[PDB]
Design a protein around this motif. Structure first.
Motif, PDB file in Angstrom:
ATOM      1  N   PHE A 204      -6.861  13.447  10.483  1.00  0.00           N
ATOM      2  CA  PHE A 204      -6.031  13.183   9.317  1.00  0.00           C
ATOM      3  C   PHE A 204      -6.884  12.852   8.153  1.00  0.00           C
ATOM      4  CE2 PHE A 204      -6.467   9.098  11.414  1.00  0.00           C
ATOM      5  CZ  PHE A 204      -6.870   8.279  10.357  1.00  0.00           C
ATOM      6  N   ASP A 205      -6.263  12.954   7.022  1.00  0.00           N
ATOM      7  CA  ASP A 205      -6.905  12.622   5.786  1.00  0.00           C
ATOM      8  C   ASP A 205      -5.918  11.682   5.087  1.00  0.00           C
ATOM      9  OD1 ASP A 205      -9.127  13.712   3.974  1.00  0.00           O
ATOM     10  OD2 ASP A 205      -7.292  13.692   2.740  1.00  0.00           O
ATOM     11  N   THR A 206      -6.420  10.667   4.369  1.00  0.00           N
ATOM     12  CA  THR A 206      -5.547   9.701   3.741  1.00  0.00           C
ATOM     13  C   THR A 206      -5.905   9.586   2.293  1.00  0.00           C
ATOM     14  OG1 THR A 206      -7.046   7.759   4.116  1.00  0.00           O
ATOM     15  CG2 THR A 206      -5.322   8.088   5.718  1.00  0.00           C
ATOM     16  N   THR A 207      -4.914   9.304   1.472  1.00  0.00           N
ATOM     17  CA  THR A 207      -5.163   9.086   0.062  1.00  0.00           C
ATOM     18  C   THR A 207      -4.278   7.865  -0.220  1.00  0.00           C
ATOM     19  OG1 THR A 207      -5.540  11.448  -0.326  1.00  0.00           O
ATOM     20  CG2 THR A 207      -4.895  10.066  -2.283  1.00  0.00           C
ATOM     21  N   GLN A 208      -4.854   6.752  -0.693  1.00  0.00           N
ATOM     22  CA  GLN A 208      -4.035   5.537  -0.766  1.00  0.00           C
ATOM     23  C   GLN A 208      -4.366   4.608  -1.918  1.00  0.00           C
ATOM     24  OE1 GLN A 208      -4.891   2.681   2.578  1.00  0.00           O
ATOM     25  NE2 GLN A 208      -6.248   4.317   3.296  1.00  0.00           N
ATOM     26  N   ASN A 209      -3.317   3.926  -2.392  1.00  0.00           N
ATOM     27  CA  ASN A 209      -3.441   2.933  -3.484  1.00  0.00           C
ATOM     28  C   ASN A 209      -2.873   1.633  -2.983  1.00  0.00           C
ATOM     29  OD1 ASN A 209      -2.654   4.962  -6.516  1.00  0.00           O
ATOM     30  ND2 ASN A 209      -4.444   4.860  -5.204  1.00  0.00           N
TER      31      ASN A 209
ATOM     32  N   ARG B 268     -12.639   7.618  -0.266  1.00  0.00           N
ATOM     33  CA  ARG B 268     -11.580   7.970  -1.238  1.00  0.00           C
ATOM     34  C   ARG B 268     -11.840   9.387  -1.825  1.00  0.00           C
ATOM     35  NH1 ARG B 268     -13.305   6.727  -6.239  1.00  0.00           N
ATOM     36  NH2 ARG B 268     -11.204   6.339  -7.264  1.00  0.00           N
ATOM     37  N   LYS B 269     -10.780  10.108  -2.218  1.00  0.00           N
ATOM     38  CA  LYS B 269     -10.874  11.351  -3.031  1.00  0.00           C
ATOM     39  C   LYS B 269     -11.867  11.230  -4.186  1.00  0.00           C
ATOM     40  CE  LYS B 269      -7.983  13.538  -0.637  1.00  0.00           C
ATOM     41  NZ  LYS B 269      -8.245  12.812   0.637  1.00  0.00           N
TER      42      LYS B 269
ATOM     43  N   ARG C 117       0.902  -1.163   0.000  1.00  0.00           N
ATOM     44  CA  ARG C 117       0.000   0.000   0.000  1.00  0.00           C
ATOM     45  C   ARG C 117       0.920   1.186   0.000  1.00  0.00           C
ATOM     46  NH1 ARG C 117      -3.314   1.646   4.673  1.00  0.00           N
ATOM     47  NH2 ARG C 117      -1.965   0.246   5.852  1.00  0.00           N
TER      48      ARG C 117
ATOM     49  N   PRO D  41     -11.437   1.452  -0.540  1.00  0.00           N
ATOM     50  CA  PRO D  41     -10.863   2.690   0.009  1.00  0.00           C
ATOM     51  C   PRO D  41      -9.735   3.265  -0.872  1.00  0.00           C
ATOM     52  CG  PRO D  41      -9.757   0.817   1.029  1.00  0.00           C
ATOM     53  CD  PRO D  41     -11.002   0.282   0.273  1.00  0.00           C
ATOM     54  N   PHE D  42      -9.401   2.588  -1.964  1.00  0.00           N
ATOM     55  CA  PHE D  42      -8.206   2.935  -2.730  1.00  0.00           C
ATOM     56  C   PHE D  42      -8.506   3.852  -3.886  1.00  0.00           C
ATOM     57  CE2 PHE D  42      -5.830   0.456  -0.151  1.00  0.00           C
ATOM     58  CZ  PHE D  42      -6.477  -0.733   0.079  1.00  0.00           C
ATOM     59  N   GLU D  43      -7.618   4.798  -4.170  1.00  0.00           N
ATOM     60  CA  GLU D  43      -7.810   5.651  -5.326  1.00  0.00           C
ATOM     61  C   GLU D  43      -7.763   4.834  -6.635  1.00  0.00           C
ATOM     62  OE1 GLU D  43      -8.614   8.415  -2.597  1.00  0.00           O
ATOM     63  OE2 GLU D  43      -8.886   8.713  -4.800  1.00  0.00           O
ATOM     64  N   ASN D  44      -6.875   3.845  -6.699  1.00  0.00           N
ATOM     65  CA  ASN D  44      -6.816   2.952  -7.879  1.00  0.00           C
ATOM     66  C   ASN D  44      -7.868   1.794  -7.810  1.00  0.00           C
ATOM     67  OD1 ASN D  44      -5.409   1.547  -5.918  1.00  0.00           O
ATOM     68  ND2 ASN D  44      -3.701   1.017  -7.221  1.00  0.00           N
ATOM     69  N   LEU D  45      -8.733   1.837  -6.783  1.00  0.00           N
ATOM     70  CA  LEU D  45      -9.896   0.969  -6.706  1.00  0.00           C
ATOM     71  C   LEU D  45      -9.458  -0.507  -6.812  1.00  0.00           C
ATOM     72  CD1 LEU D  45     -12.289   3.296  -8.607  1.00  0.00           C
ATOM     73  CD2 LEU D  45     -12.619   2.416  -6.258  1.00  0.00           C
ATOM     74  N   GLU D  46      -8.454  -0.881  -6.000  1.00  0.00           N
ATOM     75  CA  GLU D  46      -7.802  -2.189  -6.158  1.00  0.00           C
ATOM     76  C   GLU D  46      -8.789  -3.278  -5.665  1.00  0.00           C
ATOM     77  OE1 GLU D  46      -5.361  -3.498  -7.586  1.00  0.00           O
ATOM     78  OE2 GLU D  46      -5.112  -5.508  -6.709  1.00  0.00           O
TER      79      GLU D  46
ATOM     80  N   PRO E  18     -10.980   6.574   5.771  1.00  0.00           N
ATOM     81  CA  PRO E  18     -11.580   7.750   5.084  1.00  0.00           C
ATOM     82  C   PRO E  18     -12.265   7.351   3.730  1.00  0.00           C
ATOM     83  CG  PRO E  18      -9.495   8.426   6.082  1.00  0.00           C
ATOM     84  CD  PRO E  18      -9.712   6.939   6.453  1.00  0.00           C
TER      85      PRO E  18
ATOM     86  N   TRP F 228      -0.451  12.517  -7.476  1.00  0.00           N
ATOM     87  CA  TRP F 228      -0.890  13.421  -6.368  1.00  0.00           C
ATOM     88  C   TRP F 228      -0.166  14.743  -6.318  1.00  0.00           C
ATOM     89  CZ3 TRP F 228      -5.660  12.731  -5.581  1.00  0.00           C
ATOM     90  CH2 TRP F 228      -6.199  11.461  -5.913  1.00  0.00           C
TER      91      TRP F 228
END
Lengths: 471, 479
Positions: free
Chosen positions: A91-96, B6-7, A79, B347-352, B4, A127
């Motif tokens: 907090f704010d999170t942005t995750q792949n 996702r964006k 991740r 929850p993932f931006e790349n929608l895994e 959270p 980002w």
């Protein structure tokens, strides 16, 4: 509900209750020994418990702000998480999430790290399309055996969780990752390598100031807490003057190795077999006694014993019950959770998966066995919690918990809160008012690693030490 | 700790796919005004159902003619008969809006769904007997009053009666349709000499209504949002024309009367609900084309299927899955509710998570921008269903002049569909236009229901027994 069980099975059930029940007095004894072993691991002689300094030497305040990365490297995925801390315990999170190409587990060093770097670049380029003013500090959750003479270092002792890549063991992984990041020109400084349990501790303390411990109760077992430098005799003579004796120090216990010596844990002949037939006999004794990974195996061996003695499964195909690890944690879990008077869930499980047809009374015995096992596991698990709290003098605590057992094993939270209540003999009605209680953790391997990176970067930027002299 | 949200950046979506995502947004959004217009038709249909001639909405009286005060005490049985399992439940009403319960749950043997009448009722009476044998090993001084939750389609001329109209949920037992099931149960009870009087037959939503009002004095409706949808609430006798001339004097015009709406059939006419070409395909290839129109637009069961048909449309139109084998996608109901659930949970931006689910379960590789469409689609579909659901709530509240209410909700969509509670709160705020900050502060709001088919049936049996002992009526004259 046991009134129709024949006496001869009833007897064997009372014998199992003998073998598997842990009294309050026994938990208390274990806790005293556990505390003694926590002290030993932090002293110079050392001990079976590693008590690994995590080089986080302060608490998060909730006041931290900024953008921090984390990299959570797992056996099959990684991740990448961007965390922006808002400065009010928020907090704010942005995750792949990126699946590891399966060739890598058993590949060569450089190609692991170059793939991780490929993932980092793609993330950052999305980002921060116009780049950053300053390199993003990154915290790396690397939850394999590894020693650290400073926060921004991790020397792999040996591979676990599937991996088997040549020339990594005995080397520092942080420069290996940092150089691939450099070759791709990604604006990232890897500033901290952490264990997930240290992350669990710090992430949860950031959002929940009452946190005194981070704990994983899953197939893995571990706990992390803050000690103080003056209580870590094994660092005497090794510390720079700016990490002085009143400084906090986060410790990654690695306490799955508590009581390898077998002086106190209530091992049954079934545990002895589990240990004997494991990849490492004589190792990880506390983990083998508490991890969810073995709970169905404990059941399997007990049933196989009862069968071989003539008590149950008369004339059944026992061939699948003979396969080690055929019963994972989902067996005791589904069995404790069976809502049916005739235990219809337990019946499906044994019929469909183990090809064993049971009677109602044998399902009753099986259910009672699953409860003993689950309950034993919880009670021994909270001995680690009690030991840290009693060692540090915490009369009250939030114990930030994560892991598949805490999270998904039915009734586990109740079993744990009762076990604490029994240890401390509290007069208290409801588990939400327990002075020491388990609460759901924040994200240790993403949020927690990013927060540690914030705390670390501040020290690095000031020239404050994050490790032993000279490292 | 849920991560959270996702964006949701759409910045890498090409213009032509982004057109299609904007087109899906246009198609699946229910505006506030449309919800208002739908609520006003819903109301006239609720009024229509209560009339002698009636209408698409059955509007069935439940013969609960008082509100539980929360001070009731005693020990009451419930029998909750399901399509798959049954429960026998004992409730000790603790008489401060509280209670304790214990139950025995039993799986129906497979042969009953398709067996005889006697075999179904004999099986029930056996489970009853086991239960009572454990909880009353010495017998009892007076019959235990029991409430029977029997949720199949049935009419009731009185609370202690239920005449089956048609079996649902796979049941295929002849010689029950058109007979009163309560004496059939009661006689098997007798044949085994158990101290039980079946004093009430209810639908589970009536139970949800009454159980939640007992525990929560602010409850004004019970709603089920699951694979099936229904709502129950209290109307007033004078408002129920189909009972005119059939009531005894002690059930007066000002008397409350619980109603089991059975409103999954609102808008069978297909006038008001906003059906897409996808809803039309769903309706046409369903087992009852033209029926259950409101259930089809709000039930969790169809959410994945809507998604499936949209994606298949987009595939056939050349927009997505361009060089994929789409085989598994052609199967009706291959995508259940767990599809849009897991997708909205990703929850993932790349929608895994979405990627994994399509690869593993449908054998389809996706690009990140196809996943971003898929995620947007799942949001739109969950959100439409919640907004249309709230139209039923709004119609009942407005019909009865409830400016405030707790709406006791149960069912797997309300309880487990991600963000469903936020979507339904938002929907009600859009209809009513409240100047309110927190959803916990909404004048009309959904709260988790008590157990309707067990606790609610036992509370109804309580209320009923009290009436029967006093000679107060609980159905139409002479019944």
């Amino acid at each position: 509900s046991m009134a129709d069980v024949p006496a001869n099975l009833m007897e064997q059930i009372h014998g199992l209750e003998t073998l598997f029940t842990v009294s309050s007095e026994k938990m208390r004894s274990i806790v005293k020994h556990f505390i003694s072993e926590l002290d030993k691991g932090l002293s110079k002689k050392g001990g079976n418990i590693p008590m690994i300094p995590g080089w986080v030497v302060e608490y998060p305040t909730g006041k931290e702000t900024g953008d921090f990365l984390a990299l959570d490297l797992g056996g099959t995925n990684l991740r990448v998480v961007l965390v922006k801390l808002g400065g009010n315990h928020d907090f704010d999170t942005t995750q792949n999430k990126y699946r590891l190409p399966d060739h890598l587990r058993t590949g060569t060093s450089e190609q692991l790290w170059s793939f991780i770097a490929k993932c980092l670049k793609e993330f950052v380029d999305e980002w921060y399309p116009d780049g950053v003013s300053e390199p993003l500090p990154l915290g790396f959750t690397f939850s394999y055996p590894a020693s650290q003479k400073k926060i921004n270092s991790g020397v792999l002792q040996r591979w676990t969780k599937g991996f088997d890549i040549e020339g990594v063991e005995g080397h520092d992984v942080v420069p290996m990752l940092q150089e691939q990041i450099e070759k791709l020109n990604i604006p990232i400084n890897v500033v901290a390598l952490i264990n997930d349990t240290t992350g669990t501790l710090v992430a949860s303390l950031y959002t929940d100031p009452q946190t005194k411990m981070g704990i994983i109760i899953g197939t893995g077992v571990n706990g992390a807490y803050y000690d103080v430098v003056s209580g870590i005799e094994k660092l005497e003579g090794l510390l720079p003057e700016d990490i002085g004796p009143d400084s906090p120090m986060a410790i990654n216990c690695e306490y799955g190795s508590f009581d390898n010596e077998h002086l106190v844990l209530p091992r049954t002949k079934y545990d002895v077999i589990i240990d004997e037939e494991s990849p490492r006999p004589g190792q990880q004794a506390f983990e083998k006694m508490t991890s969810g990974y073995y709970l169905g195996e404990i059941m399997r061996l007990v049933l196989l014993d009862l069968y071989d003695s003539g008590f149950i499964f008369k004339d059944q195909d026992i061939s699948k019950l003979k396969e080690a690890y055929v019963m994972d944690t989902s067996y005791p879990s589904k069995i404790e959770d069976d809502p049916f008077e005739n235990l219809e869930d337990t019946d499906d499980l044994f019929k469909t998966n183990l090809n064993i047809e049971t009677t109602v009374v044998e399902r009753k015995l099986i259910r009672k066995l699953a409860e003993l096992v689950g309950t034993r596991a919880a009670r021994l698990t909270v001995c680690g919690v009690s030991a840290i709290c009693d060692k540090r003098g915490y009369k009250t605590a939030h114990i930030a918990a994560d892991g598949s057992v805490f999270n998904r094993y039915p009734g586990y939270k109740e079993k744990a809160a009762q076990a604490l209540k029994d240890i401390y003999n509290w007069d208290v009605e409801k588990m939400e008012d327990h002075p020491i209680q388990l609460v759901a953790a924040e994200d240790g391997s993403g949020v927690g690693a990013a927060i540690i990176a914030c705390l670390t970067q501040k020290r690095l930027a000031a020239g404050k030490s994050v490790g032993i002299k000279g490292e």
